[PDB]
Design an enzyme around this catalytic site. Structure first.
Site, PDB file in Angstrom:
ATOM      1  N   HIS D   8       0.854  -1.246   0.000  1.00 19.39           N
ATOM      2  CA  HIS D   8      -0.160  -0.135   0.105  1.00 19.39           C
ATOM      3  C   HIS D   8       1.122   1.307   0.088  1.00 19.39           C
ATOM      4  O   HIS D   8       1.666   1.337   0.686  1.00 19.39           O
ATOM      5  CB  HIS D   8      -0.957   0.023   1.204  1.00 19.39           C
ATOM      6  CG  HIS D   8      -1.894   1.077   1.178  1.00 19.39           C
ATOM      7  ND1 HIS D   8      -1.742   2.288   1.530  1.00 19.39           N
ATOM      8  CD2 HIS D   8      -3.223   1.126   1.278  1.00 19.39           C
ATOM      9  CE1 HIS D   8      -2.824   3.194   1.615  1.00 19.39           C
ATOM     10  NE2 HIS D   8      -3.677   2.343   1.294  1.00 19.39           N
ATOM     11  N   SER D  65      -7.440   1.457  -3.738  1.00 15.05           N
ATOM     12  CA  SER D  65      -8.544   1.150  -2.429  1.00 15.05           C
ATOM     13  C   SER D  65      -8.741   2.533  -2.214  1.00 15.05           C
ATOM     14  O   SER D  65      -8.206   3.661  -2.303  1.00 15.05           O
ATOM     15  CB  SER D  65      -7.887   0.592  -1.447  1.00 15.05           C
ATOM     16  OG  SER D  65      -6.704   0.978  -1.001  1.00 15.05           O
ATOM     17  N   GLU D 145     -13.314  -4.810   2.271  1.00 11.95           N
ATOM     18  CA  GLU D 145     -12.311  -4.912   3.153  1.00 11.95           C
ATOM     19  C   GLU D 145     -13.130  -4.811   4.654  1.00 11.95           C
ATOM     20  O   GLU D 145     -13.779  -3.838   4.881  1.00 11.95           O
ATOM     21  CB  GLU D 145     -11.251  -4.053   3.189  1.00 11.95           C
ATOM     22  CG  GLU D 145     -10.097  -4.263   4.359  1.00 11.95           C
ATOM     23  CD  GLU D 145      -9.187  -3.300   4.234  1.00 11.95           C
ATOM     24  OE1 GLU D 145      -9.123  -2.550   3.264  1.00 11.95           O
ATOM     25  OE2 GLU D 145      -7.990  -3.526   5.178  1.00 11.95           O
ATOM     26  N   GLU D 151     -13.384   1.797  13.316  1.00 11.39           N
ATOM     27  CA  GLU D 151     -13.327   2.596  11.777  1.00 11.39           C
ATOM     28  C   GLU D 151     -14.747   2.335  11.056  1.00 11.39           C
ATOM     29  O   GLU D 151     -15.129   3.150  10.190  1.00 11.39           O
ATOM     30  CB  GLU D 151     -12.193   1.627  10.802  1.00 11.39           C
ATOM     31  CG  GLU D 151     -10.780   2.188  11.525  1.00 11.39           C
ATOM     32  CD  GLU D 151      -9.712   1.993  11.039  1.00 11.39           C
ATOM     33  OE1 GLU D 151      -9.883   1.998   9.308  1.00 11.39           O
ATOM     34  OE2 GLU D 151      -8.624   1.777  11.443  1.00 11.39           O
ATOM     35  N   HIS D 181      -6.752  -5.495  11.494  1.00 14.79           N
ATOM     36  CA  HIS D 181      -8.212  -5.450  11.890  1.00 14.79           C
ATOM     37  C   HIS D 181      -8.944  -6.827  12.426  1.00 14.79           C
ATOM     38  O   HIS D 181      -9.397  -6.720  13.555  1.00 14.79           O
ATOM     39  CB  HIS D 181      -9.056  -5.348  10.618  1.00 14.79           C
ATOM     40  CG  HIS D 181      -8.991  -3.813  10.191  1.00 14.79           C
ATOM     41  ND1 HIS D 181      -8.956  -2.541  11.007  1.00 14.79           N
ATOM     42  CD2 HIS D 181      -8.606  -3.326   9.174  1.00 14.79           C
ATOM     43  CE1 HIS D 181      -8.753  -1.477  10.414  1.00 14.79           C
ATOM     44  NE2 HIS D 181      -8.581  -2.000   9.037  1.00 14.79           N
ATOM     45  N   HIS D 204      -4.325  -7.897   3.675  1.00 17.25           N
ATOM     46  CA  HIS D 204      -3.634  -6.927   4.208  1.00 17.25           C
ATOM     47  C   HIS D 204      -2.603  -7.528   5.327  1.00 17.25           C
ATOM     48  O   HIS D 204      -3.304  -8.077   6.271  1.00 17.25           O
ATOM     49  CB  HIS D 204      -4.230  -5.569   4.763  1.00 17.25           C
ATOM     50  CG  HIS D 204      -4.322  -4.742   3.535  1.00 17.25           C
ATOM     51  ND1 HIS D 204      -5.101  -3.461   3.655  1.00 17.25           N
ATOM     52  CD2 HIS D 204      -3.681  -4.587   2.474  1.00 17.25           C
ATOM     53  CE1 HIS D 204      -4.968  -2.889   2.441  1.00 17.25           C
ATOM     54  NE2 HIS D 204      -4.241  -3.155   1.753  1.00 17.25           N
ATOM     55  N   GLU D 239       0.866  -2.760   4.801  1.00 18.90           N
ATOM     56  CA  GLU D 239      -0.158  -1.808   4.912  1.00 18.90           C
ATOM     57  C   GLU D 239       0.529  -1.279   6.118  1.00 18.90           C
ATOM     58  O   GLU D 239       0.548  -1.819   7.283  1.00 18.90           O
ATOM     59  CB  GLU D 239      -1.495  -1.985   4.994  1.00 18.90           C
ATOM     60  CG  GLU D 239      -2.067  -0.707   5.255  1.00 18.90           C
ATOM     61  CD  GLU D 239      -3.924  -0.675   5.249  1.00 18.90           C
ATOM     62  OE1 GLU D 239      -4.387  -1.860   5.554  1.00 18.90           O
ATOM     63  OE2 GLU D 239      -4.174  -0.076   4.298  1.00 18.90           O
TER      64      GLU D 239
END
Ligand code: SDD
Ligand code: SDD
Ligand code: SDD
Ligand code: SDD
Ligand code: HVC
Ligand code: HVC
Ligand code: HVC
Ligand code: MG
Ligand code: MG
Ligand code: MG
Ligand code: MG
Lengths: 282, 283, 282, 283
Positions: D8, D65, D145, D151, D181, D204, D239
């Protein structure tokens, strides 16, 4: 074999009549689905008595062993075939559904040099003959990979699969053991992955043979990978609260693995059942 | 007290002859380590002055390690064990080493089939007391490495190692742990460090299969976090069995390659360990 | 505090009379050493009823809160001092031994940029005033590091210690939380290491606020590192199971964290107590 | 069908402007990655012919993205979301990107304050159905995602992501997981991979604090073992917010450096991840 089981060293040193009674009663206390019975002195097993206990208490069973030196398949294959035939008959007679473990050699077997093709050729001939006999009695055979200090021939999932392929039978499965994979596998999940097409049975044994959940085995990796490959075979505990004398020298339990069976079963089995639920095992 | 990062030289040399010593010191410089651990398979044959000069010229510190041969296993042949250890201690001191460590209390391959006895431990204690006095007279320390149940039945955990140190009562014997052995023996790998915390001066950083650190089943985060939390002051020594000579390897139950080659082990494993040591502040 | 305790949110977030009774009943059921009492509305707490309950049942306690927006210390320090003084007096009067939690700010603070010296100076003035009031009532104060999304000011053990150094009081300690450390710490043990001179309390919470033992927290590293630094403070289980919805939504609980209390307490508390025994914290 | 390793571009640039595109593509070549992931946060500002030329010149693949801006959050302003996604899809395709992934169904930092509702999911499904037809018309796929509870309140787990892909019924939407995440949301990290296994085409590999992979709290051995077990064959992408795109900074919550610099994250993190992929037989 399906669900949760326990190797009977949890409760008895010897599979004699008093020991069989003690183990079956203890298994009832924990609501396990099956037990794994050592077949280390086949002519001494009272199969009628064990079968009665298993059927009365609605318990399934399989047997496991290591070969005595006089009958190690790698060097004395004719003696190994004769020994396995007797072990298979006794397993079948008591109602066991498979004979697994170190059926290809000794617990503590070492030549001092790496394994050779001549040894593997002998083992293949032994297992081919044993597998035919097993088929005639309606049971399967399992090949358990064990660590480098207990046997020099089959230590990894990939070696176990290679032997199943070398033999070319249709009734031999791979048996893995997390205590052994903790030493031998380059990342524990790799043993499961390498064995996936043949894996029907796994010893969920802690790194020091003590209480699952309280050692160095990578349990989350183990259970995630079992779920990923769709494992639906036996999940069996193995903790040497008691030590069968014919394999003690090879198993190397020189100090207590835990306080007693109450501790291992009271803390370890809930941990494993909860992990199997967490990762959704079939 | 060794400091920083070092390497057990088995990856280049188990026979510490003149070319073997040069090859190992050249590797140590290539990988920019602080110290080397010198294996002493045959103490009498070591050229102490050549090694001392090499270490001093290259500002490299060192210690030595061994396991007792069967003719000198301390638990059963304590007189012979003392004689073997005295020679190794003198050679270590004379080459400038700061300690003799390893399985100095027994040998690889000891196994009675039953638990260790007081008689065995009494003989080991007598041997280590004599060896410790000799080491003191030469100004070096001794290390007791706990190894797993299959290699020796006498000292397998940090707590057993500490009990023996207490039994001997010397001031110059420390505990040497090995993550490969702890991965089997300790009930949670940090517990070996916790139990040995008052005496831990050296640790072998070895992967669970003796291959490449970072790529196995050892719990490295727990290992490094616990070392940091006890304030570990001592040697961080990488140990891998890659490229070990065959007869040595077979004695340690190496029946198949532990890794692809040295570039895998040193190129991936050393940075992993140094990065972890920095991460947890051991640097 | 010493031994094991529970944050009572699983039974009570509103510490009224029946809520206090329900929480103390649960504490006895699970045989804990202490409870952590949430103070959503300090003025409303009946200090004498709570004190009598704790004393009769041989239970120790501390209290915790987060500052409401009208009193966020970084921007409204005078109001923060007034709010903390009331909470400190209620804590002392009910027999509590400390006031901990997000006493330096509130859940929902976020500027979009890194925390500033002006923010930290206001927090330090607030905590200095509060620490003096706490000392006059015989209790300590705890600063809980929480993750980046809940507050932008104190997220790591090292940041918490820097604030303790900035204030210069002797009765403020660090309170860590394994759920927050699982996000914030560069290796979870580093939060304990960085806070080692000030760590007197830790929330043992799974990574998803569900059942300890069944998530992504590195429990072996956590307990080994606590033992290695000689931790002698409170081990307090925190789970969001059965949290009142209003409070749960403010902590970003958008879906159940676990099946029920039987799962969380029946699996989670034994897991944590077993780990504490395993690593010698007891 | 992205494959191999990618990054990323926040590793290297805060905005995808012309100077930022040149910087990021140059850095990507230095590490021999297979593709880059380009933020599509200001579509009318992207110089697509300039980026296309750079990618083609340097034989680099790409995808894009985004997260939706509040004015176009699909759960409450679905018509605006469709119009925004159509523009983002067109720009992605024009620069040669092969997919548009990320939080394409909502905002980075989106929160109602209460749990998600069926009416919100109905809006998202309508938006994604329309966006998927537009993506098919430009020859690219869409990715969903799952991100953590702080978030976004709508899609936090692999299982929720799969439920949305099934609800929409389009064959050109895949699931995109993120280990940072999942470290928060998945009850055991492997469960996110297992739950998403029929639709998982991109992941990711992001450390737990957005810093260097291998030096946080993510369960990497579990992650890689489970990826291997399910036969994962899509993109493996780093990322790490060395640089922070301004339009999502408030939602991403990077208040202090995640690591020293890109040299540290790429120099230590990428080899770790490549070595793990080799170890578990992905690559
Ligand atoms: O793990 C094992 C030996 O190391 C085997 O599993 C063995 O215990 C057999 O069951 C013997 O009954
Ligand atoms: O771990 C060890 C043996 O298992 C020792 O470290 C051994 O390698 C010898 O001391 C070699 O010098
Ligand atoms: O971890 C926490 C918030 O994220 C705190 O422990 C919180 O639960 C409050 O202090 C409760 O009183
Ligand atoms: O991990 C992420 C944000 O939390 C995503 O990768 C984010 O980058 C958006 O989906 C695209 O920027
Ligand atoms: O089967 C019941 C029983 O108690 O099992 C154990 C055996 O030693 C005894 O002889 C028998 O009566
Ligand atoms: O502080 C931990 C420790 O073990 O304390 C004793 C000391 O001999 C060692 O050097 C050190 O590692
Ligand atoms: O494509 C090459 C280049 O350097 O990329 C960056 C851009 O700002 C410059 O205008 C252009 O010449
Ligand atoms: Mg076994
Ligand atoms: Mg060693
Ligand atoms: Mg907390
Ligand atoms: Mg992401």
């Amino acid at each position: 074999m399906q669900g949760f089981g326990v190797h009977t060293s949890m409760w008895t040193m010897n599979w004699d009549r008093p020991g069989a009674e003690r183990a079956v009663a203890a298994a009832l206390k924990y609501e396990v689905d099956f037990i794994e019975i050592p077949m280390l002195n086949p002519p001494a097993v009272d199969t009628e008595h064990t079968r009665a206990l298993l059927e009365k208490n609605e318990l399934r069973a399989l047997c496991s062993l290591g070969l005595p030196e006089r009958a190690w398949a790698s060097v004395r294959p004719d003696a190994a075939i004769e020994h396995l035939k007797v072990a298979i008959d006794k397993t079948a007679d008591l109602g066991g559904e498979a004979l697994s473990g170190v059926i290809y050699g000794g617990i503590g077997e070492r030549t001092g040099v790496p394994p050779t093709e001549a040894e593997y050729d002998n083992i293949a001939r032994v297992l081919s003959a044993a597998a035919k006999h097993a088929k005639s009695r309606g049971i399967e055979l399992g090949v358990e990979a064990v660590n480098r200090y207990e046997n020099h021939l089959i230590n990894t999932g990939w070696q176990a699969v290679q032997m199943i392929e070398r033999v070319g039978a249709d009734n031999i499965f791979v048996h893995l053991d997390t205590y052994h994979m903790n030493i031998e596998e380059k990342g524990v999940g790799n043993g499961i992955l390498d064995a996936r097409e043949h894996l029907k049975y796994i010893h969920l044994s802690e790194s020091d043979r003590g209480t699952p959940g309280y050692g160095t085995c990578g349990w989350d990796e183990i259970f995630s990978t079992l779920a990923a490959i769709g494992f639906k075979g036996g999940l069996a505990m193995e903790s040497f609260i008691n030590m069968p004398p014919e394999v003690a020298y090879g198993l190397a339990v020189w100090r207590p693995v835990a306080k007693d069976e109450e501790e291992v079963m009271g803390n370890g089995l809930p941990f494993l059942r909860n992990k199997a639920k967490q990762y959704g095992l079939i």
